[PDB]
Symmetry: none
Subunit: 187 residues, 4 copies
Amino acid sequence: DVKPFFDAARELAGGRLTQAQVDELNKVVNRLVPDDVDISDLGVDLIRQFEGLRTRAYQDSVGIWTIGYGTIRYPNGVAVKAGDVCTEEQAKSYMKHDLQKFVKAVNKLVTVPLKQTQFDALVSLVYNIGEGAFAGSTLLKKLNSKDYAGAAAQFLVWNKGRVKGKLEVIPGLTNRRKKEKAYFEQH
Amino acid sequence: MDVKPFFDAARELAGGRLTQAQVDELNKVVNRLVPDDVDISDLGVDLIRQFEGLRTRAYQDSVGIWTIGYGTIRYPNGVAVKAGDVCTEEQAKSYMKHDLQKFVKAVNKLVTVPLKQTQFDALVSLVYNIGEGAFAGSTLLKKLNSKDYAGAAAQFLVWNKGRVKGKLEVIPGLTNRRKKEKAYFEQHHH
Amino acid sequence: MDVKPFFDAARELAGGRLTQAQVDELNKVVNRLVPDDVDISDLGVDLIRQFEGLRTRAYQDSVGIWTIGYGTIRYPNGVAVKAGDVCTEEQAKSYMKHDLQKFVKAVNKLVTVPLKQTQFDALVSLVYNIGEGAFAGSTLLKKLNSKDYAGAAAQFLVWNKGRVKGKLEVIPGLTNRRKKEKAYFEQH
Amino acid sequence: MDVKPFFDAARELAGGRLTQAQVDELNKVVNRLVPDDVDISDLGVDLIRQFEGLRTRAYQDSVGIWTIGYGTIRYPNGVAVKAGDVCTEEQAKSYMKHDLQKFVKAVNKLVTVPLKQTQFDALVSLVYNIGEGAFAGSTLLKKLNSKDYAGAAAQFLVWNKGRVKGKLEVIPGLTNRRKKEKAYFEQHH
């Protein structure tokens, strides 16, 4: 029931809403679901499958204590330390919390509307390439246009990573972008 | 105004609370809902009218153009003042308010910082007296859009010259006009 | 208007996030930084004066009360009008502007939706003529406070009646007045 | 706290300046925006530590709950203490400091007058022992928020009772603890 919201908005606007203002309100109503637009548990499943589950805390390559699916700090802010243990279900919940920076980034940077499956796939990509890369990205140019084609094709462009100091195609990244692109394309 | 009912309604849609991003989104739409352009007030028309002679019968000004009221040449419906026309004071106020819309539009476009109504009215009075090009090139507008409101106020007083024969000079009464407009502009209350 | 720099600065002061109570506090203070000011316009006063006679010396109205100007029975200083009083038209207009302040307040209070200045003007005229009590209970006001501005405009014309020997009937002139007020309410 | 961007943003909204009344209402919002934020000091933790023995091996308390350190039953990461757990004195201090964070928050939220660090530390020691609810409804807090510091100090001494055979009775151990907390609260120089 958006009638109270629309009436409260009429007050702010002077009594009536223009057609453009109705369109801007309608965009806001989509963001007013409880806790805002978030990655779904299926989107978390999409992401976890590309990583290893560790039930015991361990030190990553740069020395940082890590648990679960790459978690270094628990939802309450406390750092993972030696001797920590987690279940699969805890590891999923920790990863969901670690994705919140990237959920927020997709919501902010994407100005056109999105289906939940498009959103989940975009969170997977941005988790893996970073906020800055996504923000500066030709993909975000084409997507902010309701072009769910040049954006979905731009997934496959992000299959490079560093080997011996240069970028080269990483087979695992090629597979992951194909799965993400297929997710973003679901009906 | 307080947007409380807007946020209350949004809060209930969002399950009892708003996240920081939801608050930011609501603030963007508030910006786009709240009307942003403004008109000169009747107290602003009085500020300008004060210094003008009122004519209730149409007359020819120095270049032959039929005029009525407080310098009106064309009515709101676009019809030129003609010989034999008559007006009341109330009509003359209404005609000059329409005459002023040129300068209301210019102050709205050219000023990029928020204005109180009293500030807006005093600027329209100045622009009416000096015109859009002088205003737009002014140090007044530069200091104002830089949020130096008090610096902008002081610049009212430099616009006290008018043409006499082939030159400009400080006019008897123009300093006093600018002073009154500066005082209006710097009102702290009501 | 633009509240984003205010909320950005408030968020950073609060430690990087705002609670629900803090958001509501910020909204409350913005309304004190930019408060709404609503008064009858000069044309709205004219709209009402249209219908009244100017009296430059006090007379008794139909119920015996001494009146002067455009219907003034108490001066801005609180003194009641009395026999022998005289006034200029400028004084009369000043008294009448003060007379309408009570109704500027009442329209602002009973109406909970925004109003264009022309809408506000026409409503003060109506409420001055019919009184707050009739206004409060009116179908007009319920539609208006529902943001049904078109519906409220058409309700003007039902207020063309008054009391003769103890019940309602149409008063000559009130139909024309309500028609003029409706037009006024509906300008663009 | 740097309130200048907030005032400057408020000035902008208001047409370039603030009236005296607007400054006064903006200052009230600032009070609501800035957290009281005091933390217990290391010396305050020592005050609370001293009432308990350090236990380096997990043990079951008097109601069966596995416990370690200075009365810790749940680690900072949220994991319950379990049988076989061991800790160092430094870890046990850490767990205590996390255990106190709920009560640090409560003292900050409930006290609305300025507090010396030593005053704050002693209040956290009391509230940890008596709980947030008892402190919230106390005469101590009402005298304290009235700027009656000396009266609040005296109110420490009335919190020396605990349950004995189902009713409240004075417990000398609590009397001695309240005396030390009051002495700590009244420090200066």
